[PDB]
């Protein structure tokens with residue numbers, strides 16, 4: 001029984017789901033935008049996930065349990081209904097939907113719907129709405145209230161494809177991997193981070209890219225399922241190794257950040273120095289630990305080229321070791337003659353500019369002095385870059 | 392790369408929002424009763440309203456908006472602002488990253504309304520009899536100073552059967568246990584969002600009154616006690632995430648939390664305070680080092696001075712805003728810009744400023760100025776007190792002698808992104824300037840505390 005958690009989409013989603021579960025009318029074909037796959041060491045996880053998927057075909061499983069979830073908090077996703085596709089036609093339909101992207105017709109959803117858990121995860125809210133009024137087939141009398149209740153329960157259930165494209169990045173890899181991982185596997189599997197963190201991690205997941213046989217790009221929910229499901233990133237080694245790479249990158253960044261922060265705090269809480277030197281130390285240590293060149297070096301050290309963890313093209317992070325040559329404060333201050341030096345290589349004199357102008361004795365001393373231009377007066381102490389005691 | 396210094400923040404807030412209080416410690420409905428009908432603050436009984444505080448400090452553009460996004464993406468909370476502009480700003484910021492709910496003001500929640508806006512606050516005396524600072528007395532005087540709105544809110548809440556949670560609890564007792572009341576907020580939308588979560592993330596919390604933290608805690612416990620919400624039943628305490636800049640946002644929540652001696656012990660700021668020292672606004676050497684000095688109270692040298700050595704008449708300064716000191720000066724500049732431009736030979740004229748409109752986007756009208764119809768805001772000049780909390784790129788500061796502060800200089804000079812679009816008058820630095828060393832010294836001492844975490 002392979003477990004397949006799927007975030008579906010419709011052309012309202014809540015009304016379609018309620019109609020589909022009740023007895024049917026309002027049943028719109030669902031669009032499996034993101035689908036999960038798991039069954040009950042890191043290499044073993046990679047091989048299991050890769051064998052569960054297939055390079056040529058889809059999910060390799062004779063029996064499929066497919067939980068359908070929407071966006072909202074019960075948890076980023078919340079189960080909406082549960083279906084078991086065990087019949088051969090059901091398995092074929094699921095294979096053609098998860099891989100090719102064909103939407104599931106209402107008849108397949110109704111026939112494969114497992115009433116037990118599907119209504120066991122909703123009888124609580126059915127009783128809640130019954131108490132509010134004082135199975136869910138009795139919503140004909142009170143229907144808009146039920147609609148509002150499921151709108152509030154599943155926040156983000158009804159969203160536009162433009163929303164998905166804007167949130168989860170414009171790129172193929174970013175879209176598929178960030179969406180699937182962040183929305184489903186973060187809760188399923190640690191890595192409870194922000195969407196920006198997942199998008200940046202997927203950005204440096206430089207696995208070999210191959211152009212699609214045809215050139216298409218994502219209006220309304222008619223195309224994004226085919227855009228995402230048939231992509232080479234949602235199947236095989238990429239899908240098998242993306243969570244592993246996210247975990248490895250998170251662990252590496254956390255260990256380097258902690259190693260830097262220990263020294264940063266220790267050599268900050270023990271300085272018996274002036275406030276100016278203290279601020280200089282803080283802004284020098286933050287530059288020494290997070291310089292754009294050093295951050296780029298760390299990113300190129302932690303990036304991988306192959307999904308398989310066995311290859312492990314990632315190199316050890318040199319950020320801490322590079323910071324060692326500067327964090328030697330065992331004891332013009334040492335912090336100044338570093339800060340200025342530091343600033344020069346990353347930013348930009350009176351003598352040279354005066355040599356360029358060859359105004360002390362020249363005619364230009366009065367070229368801006370007597371020319372008050374009508375502002376104020378004290379003239380040729382209300383001193384005169386004029387009118388001082390402007391920018 | 393501030394995505395990894397935020398996970399200690401997440402851990403600490405989740406730990407602080409999970410601890411359960413004792414039954415004898417949580418407030419009970421009887422405390423709100425007989426105080427709702429009480430007339431004078433003198434009859435206020437000594438009662439404790441437990442609460443927890445997490446603080447995010449820093450300067451504008453320090454990444455202080457991404458932490459709110461993370462909190463409202465992995466923790467259950469209600470994002471709330473001191474003003475509507477701030478609420479809209481974080482709504483745009485966070486709804487540009489993930490799902491967002493309409494961020495209501497601290498006025499919309501908390502029960503605050505239009506009639507509550509106008510009140511004769513502060514006309515009730517209070518003498519601190521005990522040891523100078525104690526939680527009982529401080530909360531009681533915060534309620535005393537803000538008594539009119541608190542009294543009206545309690546009367547409205549208790550006067551206006553509230554079985555939304557109790558009916559579900561009765562059914563769970565008959566049957567399920569502590570699982571059906573969690574779906575109550577999703578069934579009845581009329582409920583305040585303070586019922587849904589004990590964490591209220593506040594952005595620009597330094598603009599809220601010193602007295603207003605206790606009022607928010609009081610009315611939150613009020614809604615929690617009348618409605619009998621599961622967080623109140625399991626004895627959860629408020630965990631307000633106050634995000635703001637004490638050195639810029641100006642007798643206020645941030646100052647009350649940082650400077651008070653006993654709130655630093657009860658709330659334990661040392662273990663629940665993060666300092667952000669990044670600044671995405673200014674990215675250049677000189678200006679960056681001067682803002683430093685202006686925020687941390689560093690000694691004034693002769694380089695940062697002279698750095699500032701490198702307006703009233705609109706004759707030739709098109710497309711700039713002016714930050715006058717007093718409101719009368721702003722009204723005068725409105726009387727001048729809408730009079731000189733009358734005969735400029737993009738304006739031609741026709742309530743928040745003095746009046747007459749300038750057509751610089753205010754371009755057309757028909758009345759329906761392009762709308763609920765003709766009241767709009769003129770951003771051409773605005774006062775230094777209100778200058779904070781906004782984002783501009785055409786500032787032209789107009790300091791005056793005699794009342795020249797450095798905190799105001801400070802606020803008015805960092806509103807712009809680049810220093811090239813900066814114009815001024817007689818210099819704030821040098822001359823006679825008044826300094827507030829308390830907040831800068833407190834921030835520096837916090838920076839020398841190993842318990843707090845700092846994130847770039």
Ligand SMILES: Cc1cccc(C)c1N(CC(=O)Nc1ccc(-c2ncon2)cc1)C(=O)C1CCS(=O)(=O)CC1
Nearest residue numbers: 283284286287339342343450668669670679682683686
């Ligand atoms: C700290 C840092 C880390 C990594 C990379 C860089 C680029 C830097 N920055 C930028 C910086 O400091 N910006 C900033 C500006 C103003 C404020 C502020 N606003 C109000 O009050 N304060 C706060 C932060 C530097 O400047 C370096 C340059 C070399 S250095 O001088 O040795 C160390 C600091």
